[PDB]
Design a protein around this motif. Structure first.
Motif, PDB file in Angstrom:
ATOM      1  N   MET A 113      -9.340   6.163   6.872  1.00  0.00           N
ATOM      2  CA  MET A 113     -10.597   5.533   6.489  1.00  0.00           C
ATOM      3  C   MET A 113     -11.338   6.408   5.487  1.00  0.00           C
ATOM      4  O   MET A 113     -11.905   5.915   4.511  1.00  0.00           O
ATOM      5  N   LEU A 114     -11.326   7.713   5.742  1.00  0.00           N
ATOM      6  CA  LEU A 114     -11.991   8.680   4.877  1.00  0.00           C
ATOM      7  C   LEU A 114     -11.364   8.711   3.487  1.00  0.00           C
ATOM      8  O   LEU A 114     -12.061   8.845   2.484  1.00  0.00           O
ATOM      9  N   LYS A 115     -10.042   8.609   3.433  1.00  0.00           N
ATOM     10  CA  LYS A 115      -9.337   8.627   2.158  1.00  0.00           C
ATOM     11  C   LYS A 115      -9.730   7.437   1.287  1.00  0.00           C
ATOM     12  O   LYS A 115      -9.911   7.577   0.078  1.00  0.00           O
ATOM     13  N   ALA A 116      -9.859   6.266   1.904  1.00  0.00           N
ATOM     14  CA  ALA A 116     -10.213   5.054   1.172  1.00  0.00           C
ATOM     15  C   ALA A 116     -11.599   5.115   0.532  1.00  0.00           C
ATOM     16  O   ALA A 116     -11.772   4.705  -0.616  1.00  0.00           O
ATOM     17  N   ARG A 117     -12.584   5.627   1.266  1.00  0.00           N
ATOM     18  CA  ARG A 117     -13.944   5.724   0.740  1.00  0.00           C
ATOM     19  C   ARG A 117     -14.016   6.683  -0.453  1.00  0.00           C
ATOM     20  O   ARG A 117     -14.746   6.436  -1.414  1.00  0.00           O
TER      21      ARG A 117
ATOM     22  N   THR B   6     -13.466  -3.071   5.879  1.00  0.00           N
ATOM     23  CA  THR B   6     -14.311  -2.159   5.118  1.00  0.00           C
ATOM     24  C   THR B   6     -13.589  -1.720   3.850  1.00  0.00           C
ATOM     25  O   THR B   6     -14.176  -1.661   2.770  1.00  0.00           O
ATOM     26  N   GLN B   7     -12.305  -1.416   3.999  1.00  0.00           N
ATOM     27  CA  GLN B   7     -11.468  -0.988   2.887  1.00  0.00           C
ATOM     28  C   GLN B   7     -11.301  -2.098   1.852  1.00  0.00           C
ATOM     29  O   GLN B   7     -11.301  -1.842   0.648  1.00  0.00           O
ATOM     30  N   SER B   8     -11.158  -3.330   2.331  1.00  0.00           N
ATOM     31  CA  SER B   8     -10.965  -4.476   1.453  1.00  0.00           C
ATOM     32  C   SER B   8     -12.152  -4.693   0.521  1.00  0.00           C
ATOM     33  O   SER B   8     -11.970  -4.995  -0.658  1.00  0.00           O
ATOM     34  N   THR B   9     -13.367  -4.538   1.040  1.00  0.00           N
ATOM     35  CA  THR B   9     -14.557  -4.720   0.218  1.00  0.00           C
ATOM     36  C   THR B   9     -14.582  -3.680  -0.898  1.00  0.00           C
ATOM     37  O   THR B   9     -14.909  -3.992  -2.042  1.00  0.00           O
ATOM     38  N   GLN B  10     -14.232  -2.444  -0.557  1.00  0.00           N
ATOM     39  CA  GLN B  10     -14.194  -1.363  -1.533  1.00  0.00           C
ATOM     40  C   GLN B  10     -13.136  -1.654  -2.593  1.00  0.00           C
ATOM     41  O   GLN B  10     -13.349  -1.418  -3.782  1.00  0.00           O
TER      42      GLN B  10
END
Lengths: 130, 51
Positions: A113-117, B6-10
């Motif tokens: 999750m951290l990597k994606a942000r 959450t990842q999809s929106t980004q």
């Protein structure tokens, strides 16, 4: 990624140490049980001897055996008390290990999750450059 | 699933930015051509001053 990567390696080694401690506690429980079992066996042997002493006609020996049995019983009682205290600690350790196993998996998920942000943040930076 | 959402929106935002960027780079090239023409005109004005 660097802060997260270092932490994952560190937690795994700690878990192994905890497992060893749990094993020692388990080993201690077995040893106390063996000692308790030995005391019970000794008491049984003493009881047979006391009966034998009466048949033999040596009154003093039989009396001595009874005194020894009481001492053995006291030791057994002490061992039992020690075992109970140890058992509660062991249960807590086991519970912690189970919780830890659930926790390490969660940590791995957190890294993804951290990597994606971070990637999203980089894209925003590119827009600023334009 | 929550993480994916959450990842999809980004991801969508990033894709949108890339599309916008592609449009923008083409515009920048066009701007350079316009900029070159005005500079040439300015040079001609300078020549008149020399006369």
């Amino acid at each position: 990624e660097k802060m997260l990567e270092q932490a994952i390696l560190e937690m795994q080694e700690d878990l192994v140490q905890l497992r060893q401690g749990v094993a020692q506690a388990i080993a201690a429980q077995k040893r106390s049980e063996k000692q308790y079992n030995d005391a019970q066996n000794e008491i049984n042997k003493w009881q047979r001897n006391a009966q034998l002493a009466l048949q033999k006609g040596d009154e003093n020996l039989a009396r001595q055996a009874l005194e020894r049995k009481k001492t053995y019983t006291d030791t057994s009682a002490a061992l039992k008390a020690s075992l109970d205290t140890q058992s509660t600690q062991v249960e807590t350790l086991k519970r912690n290990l189970i919780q830890l196993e659930s926790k390490i998996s969660e940590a791995k998920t957190k890294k993804e999750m951290l990597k994606a942000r971070i990637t999203t943040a980089k894209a925003q930076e590119q827009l600023q450059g334009m």
